[PDB]
Symmetry: D4
Subunit: 201 residues, 8 copies
């Protein structure tokens, strides 16, 4: 293994979270808490002063991460700014797992030139995580322009025929470019977990 | 007619011997007569019956009467994602040409090789209307829409296996494009798009 | 091109909106802000005094529109009053793009005589935008009575088997009348954007 | 019977040799015997077996015994959207006539040409019950419902390709009509409508 | 025709409602207002003192109904008490249209003996309206025990696989008993409208 | 075996020559050997190959070896809504009998004629487990469940046209019953129900 | 029969509940009230002092349960802690029906060793109730490891492709292991009702 | 190529005489040439045409040119739930071997008999990437994912009747796994998984 300790933040209370963190207090292992609301990080902030909270990602990391474990990096590519929350959930979990992360945000195919401008970075990552909602055309465009494993995270942003991520998920599952592999809606952590395993072979 | 255009005949309910009778009921006093979604077999059935009729095999459409030459200088670009889309692409391309519009075919420029789309980007941008035909994911419409300033009509096709859902995924992707300038028709409806593209191009 | 500046109003805050408007302050180009709530237009109204807000459409236009750019007009036809919000979103975006707009509201096929009464206007537009929800029979009736491009906007009004616009969308996609072409639910802007391109050839 | 009406026989599970046996089990001591959704082939299979039986090919229904003449002065209007709806239209029209009701057929008056519907509007308004049969979008029910003051029964049919969803879209459109006076049956269920229309007309 | 004036109560405000009622003040024709909330009937109750409000049905009737127009009656049969709101919407609209109404409530097939106990009444109506949700087995049981037109109203009560009435609607559409004819979810008015037309031939 | 019961063989992936080989791989040192969902043709294919094998045509199941006589005094009631349900009814009835349970068949007692259900209500109430098999609407489970104090297992079948959705509507209706005592299996899964009913009855 | 009195707690008010309990006051028969909110148990707690409330299960039992009616027991096995509410609804209803209940909670296949650790108990029950959501793989794993009737309850926990229990329900309906039999989402009572009938033959 | 790998050919749109022409268009100046989803009949059609071509019947794939021996010491584990998954398992196993990866096949270890999965657990854990292929419920991915520390790619297959929904239920189950390390592809897409597994293993 060699992964840190992860805490899910949805069904657990701010108290329950502190109790799990104090149980894993020894060893100086990094602890990640995902999907942790801002209000559920207010109550416990007096409890853990040495903890950091990534507001957009709703993730909280207590304990110093040492260096990256590999020189390579993972690129987190997003289609629109509405994707940045699950994107930062992915990028923060990857960085906590000891990965260098290069964020290429808001490069949707509506403005396709923006994506080509950052292609040198995207093509040089060991893994690419593409995060998009609405219509997941970005996963397919990037998938056909890189030669590295791509993990697609569809996002639940959007009303109507967006279906809170279903259309994006179906698009990514139908991606023409082979080598795209998909995770569940908003699962920015699960992508970074699989991406971290690939990067850190 | 309340829409001054050629005569159209469904083909999803009509038999071979019926097609001759339905065509002959509106034959002389009309423009060309077009028949869509007509089986590939019922053109041998009527080739002696309708000797002056033509059949476009891939398009599954039959045109009786002389096809009008382009009544307009502009052209309509029919852009296809993969070769599997050519049946509905040719239904659109034959429908457009029958209504008197020039067509420029840009086939198999799917987003997997975006470079291929850029190589033919000059022709696509030069059309007055663009018909983008795709399936599986249907991302080409979104990509083309954001690269052209002319009206785009997106046709999802039922091509594809698995979660393709016989065109539903492509239709949903196209309806949910962020690039504006995109209007959508029903799955495999290459005719309906060429019908609208013809009105835009005619104007 | 020759279109004005558009601002989406959903994910942006009233502050962020003013900052985008002040960045595009020079040139005297019209600026349109769509899907802009009444509460998100209260906060910024001291900021932009010269801006107008179309309450029903939730659209805000700062800067004087010059004349129409074409003598032709676009007809915005609605089935019921419940469709007027996305209708005005369409009509305001079209008028901001420099189109003359003729509004033919509340002519659903339940009272089909009302639609025939205004057919002289609908038939004389260069483009028709038909907006309906519940059951999109109006797009098909109008489509078969006009000889001009029709763009159908299904609306999300309604509960139960209305499916928040899905049934209307499917009906319009199955419209018997050829020449109907459909946009996404509530996308009054997208229809007016495509309609404006057609009208202003 | 708890519903004083003729004998009905499904045909979706029955074989040819079975249809003779099922009909003969309730033959003399009954009204006419009707069989719905019976294959177009298993009427040659039984035409010598049941020589006094009739078959309506388009309707896929077989009636043994003398059909009753209209026991009522009113009639039932069976209004169809396109010719593709005639199979379920005739299932409704043959079911209605077998129960002893006059039928006036108004076929192929879809909303694409609303003028056609108005030309036959006098006959439709004159019925005691109206059966509107349509598919694809299914807008005729809504249009007719708002133009008639008699009860309308709407039958969606599975006609149509693509997002037609084999009658689901039509069914949804009809259930979500704003014009009141409309009640709906299941897809392709031309019998169930004529069954209800017969009770209304009989009254 | 010969039906009263109907007012929909959903998209109209309590003020707008009073203005429509005062416009139809003359003739002494009954006016029905359906789907009219309790809070939207508080505000207008000083406006129309002579109006009655049926709380469960969310319907408001101003103006005296004269006698029934036919000796026959319509039976409103419900499966469970959760169906009573749309049931009373149906029964009140039918009674306002000049129909005698016999309410046979809470006779779901779970306790099938209760339904047989009231069968003498149900079988003697000119029309039967069966209202049920969850699983619409009651429409089919009654349909096969009566020889009169049945109109089925599926109701939106229930979570999970109830699908807010979809399962009930599909069951009723698949009713084995012929002569069932179905309306849209919760459309207690539409059933009573069609039932009233049948009863009052 | 971790579930002391006879040997079961899918039939949805197996060929005729394969069925003999799969049966012979677990033949002598076993209880009877049962094969479900096996084509009606691949029993002529093996009738000389497996001369001691029996085939129940309607059930599409083949049993090799002597069937055990009821090892219990109670019986399992297999209640069917219409004759169209007998294929999956017999899959359940043959599976139950192979496991050594008595079966009482109550076929075609759909809720359309509730009187028919009451006429055979004594036999149904007398079973230790009741299997209710229905489709289209699937109301019988709810009706039977509220009339019996023994455990009921409901099997939806894909019988039916239109909005029947090939068993989905029946499955949904049964899962959403108000009468308690009802547990549901997957569409057409007459085996899975008889498998559970056998364990309840055995106990 | 021989089952206690059950009261549904969803559509009934705290007052209506006390009135039903006082009507069934005589005989000293246990009374179970399911799906009874904490706020709907506050109001009535002065009314019934001798009643107990199972907070997690939202169930209230008034009246002393005598001994179990059978030496056998029913095992309630859950995949994650998020399943414990409907699990306790099942376990409390079973115990009120006179069954011994052995709770094997939070043994999802993610940590499959935990399930094998408690297999000796699960295999010795007369009936097994398996409760899971998200992906119902636990019903299938247990079903293939026991030789006793299993009743699967899918739970509605989860967003996105969880579909508020639909995916779990479909998985359990497709369980490879025969002998699984399924109930409706969250129907912890219905499983315990059928399980109690089996256990108490 | 922008992805340095062998030549791939769809087979869902291509005819026999077409496959020879499409292969010959990119034949000498390439790595091996692979064709997926190619009918089991159009290999007799081309076996004299392409005498140096091989066909894997179960996989429905044809490889022209010499297959590369493992260019890596690690292997890819292709784990199958039931024998009904072997067609898409072999599409994955043949795709992986063509790209130059060792494959260890672990077939028919469904969760019904978890003991079978543990007996081959050493081989599965020893792979650099694991491809888990399943249908019906698709629980194996979740079970395997929680027992291995290497990346798992889950392939749902359309195997199964009833509410299996032709792979939708399996796909949904796999996407909604709690065990992390699992990434999913589209239904029956054994190629797409072996394509990604090959890149991971190559690294
Ligand atoms: N078995 C298989 N399953 C899934 N994908 C497979 C595949 N074999 C090749 N592929 C890959 O599919 C891609 C294209 O298919 P190819 O064999 O060339 O075939 P082609 O005829 O180009 O594409 C056929 C279908 O692909 C759809 N597509 C492809 C690419 C882009 C988009 C879009 O609209 O943006 C849509 C398109 O709508 C059409 O219906 C290639 O990258 C190829 O490697
Ligand atoms: N009301 C409206 N309806 C439809 N389209 C509208 C629109 N307003 C702007 N747009 C257009 O859509 C774009 C959306 O951006 P904005 O609304 O500012 O919002 P932004 O945060 O940039 O993106 C919102 C969502 O769009 C998705 N997206 C965008 C672009 C391409 C792709 C892809 O994967 O290929 C996906 C992305 O996943 C994200 O969840 C705008 O740049 C504009 O061109
Ligand atoms: N390939 C094609 N795809 C889509 N539409 C096509 C078409 N070819 C002609 N059309 C157009 O279809 C229309 C009618 O079809 P036609 O070929 O005449 O054929 P027709 O038999 O009149 O219509 C067949 C189907 O159309 C449905 N429809 C049509 C019109 C109105 C409504 C309604 O219920 O209100 C329903 C109707 O339910 C029936 O199932 C014409 O305007 C024609 O131009
Ligand atoms: N409870 C009820 N359930 C079902 N139908 C009911 C109803 N109350 C009135 N109605 C009837 O439905 C009509 C709806 O109008 P109202 O409720 O006042 O409301 P209104 O705002 O006029 O329309 C509401 C919705 O109806 C849709 N509509 C109406 C008419 C035809 C079409 C079409 O496209 O063909 C669509 C329209 O898209 C809009 O979103 C009423 O005029 C009345 O005849
Ligand atoms: N074409 C047609 N479309 C729709 N319904 C039709 C019909 N022809 C007869 N019917 C009516 O169908 C009813 C029964 O069908 P029949 O022809 O006798 O045939 P039968 O074999 O009894 O029923 C076949 C199917 O009916 C389903 N059904 C029927 C009754 C009750 C329920 C239930 O579970 O409670 C289910 C049952 O699940 C089975 O799959 C009769 O009342 C008959 O008048
Ligand atoms: N938690 C639970 N989950 C599942 N079933 C449960 C239950 N609690 C009681 N039940 C049982 O279900 C019944 C529901 O009644 P209750 O919860 O008190 O509620 P009630 O208001 O009587 O009925 C609620 C809903 O049940 C529908 N229903 C009931 C009976 C039969 C039919 C039909 O059309 O055939 C439909 C009816 O349409 C209504 O919308 C109870 O009498 C009880 O036997
Ligand atoms: N007719 C029938 N309907 C339903 N289930 C039936 C059955 N006949 C046997 N079974 C049972 O099915 C089970 C396996 O099928 P078998 O006949 O051995 O056949 P097998 O080839 O092992 O399985 C075929 C299918 O089962 C699926 N499955 C099975 C077990 C576990 C999982 C998983 O992914 O975890 C999936 C798998 O995805 C594959 O597509 C056995 O326990 C057997 O008793
Ligand atoms: N954000 C995330 N997205 C996806 N997976 C995530 C995750 N965070 C943790 N996980 C993983 O998923 C597990 C879920 O547990 P946790 O979030 O703490 O929550 P917990 O309450 O243990 O379980 C939550 C839900 O998981 C379902 N579940 C869990 C395990 C297996 C099965 C089964 O039936 O086979 C089902 C169970 O039915 C319950 O409703 C964690 O132990 C962790 O390994
Ligand atoms: Mg943006
Ligand atoms: Mg290609
Ligand atoms: Mg554009
Ligand atoms: Mg109105
Ligand atoms: Mg027509
Ligand atoms: Mg009317
Ligand atoms: Mg009750
Ligand atoms: Mg029957
Ligand atoms: Mg019971
Ligand atoms: Mg946990
Ligand atoms: Mg197996
Ligand atoms: Mg893992």
């Amino acid at each position: 293994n060699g992964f840190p300790e992860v805490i899910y933040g949805a069904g657990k209370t701010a108290t329950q979270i502190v109790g799990i963190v104090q149980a894993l207090s020894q060893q100086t292992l990094p602890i990640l808490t995902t999907r942790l609301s801002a209000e559920k990080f207010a109550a416990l902030q007096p409890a853990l002063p040495t903890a950091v909270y990534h507001a957009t990602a709703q993730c909280m990391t207590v304990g110093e991460q040492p260096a990256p474990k590999t020189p390579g990096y993972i690129a987190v590519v997003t289609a629109g700014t509405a994707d940045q929350p699950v994107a930062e959930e992915a990028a923060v979990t990857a960085e906590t797992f000891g990965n260098r992360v290069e964020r290429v945000y808001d490069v949707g195919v509506a403005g396709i030139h923006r994506l080509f401008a950052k292609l040198d970075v995207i093509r040089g990552a060991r893994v690419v995580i593409v995060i998009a909602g609405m219509e997941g055309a970005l996963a397919s465009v990037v998938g056909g322009l890189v030669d590295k494993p791509v993990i697609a995270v569809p996002t639940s942003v959007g009303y109507g025929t967006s279906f809170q991520g279903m259309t994006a998920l179906l698009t990514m599952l139908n991606s023409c470019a082979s080598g795209i592999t998909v995770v569940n809606i908003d699962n920015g952590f699960g992508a970074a977990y699989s991406a971290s395993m690939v990067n850190q072979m």
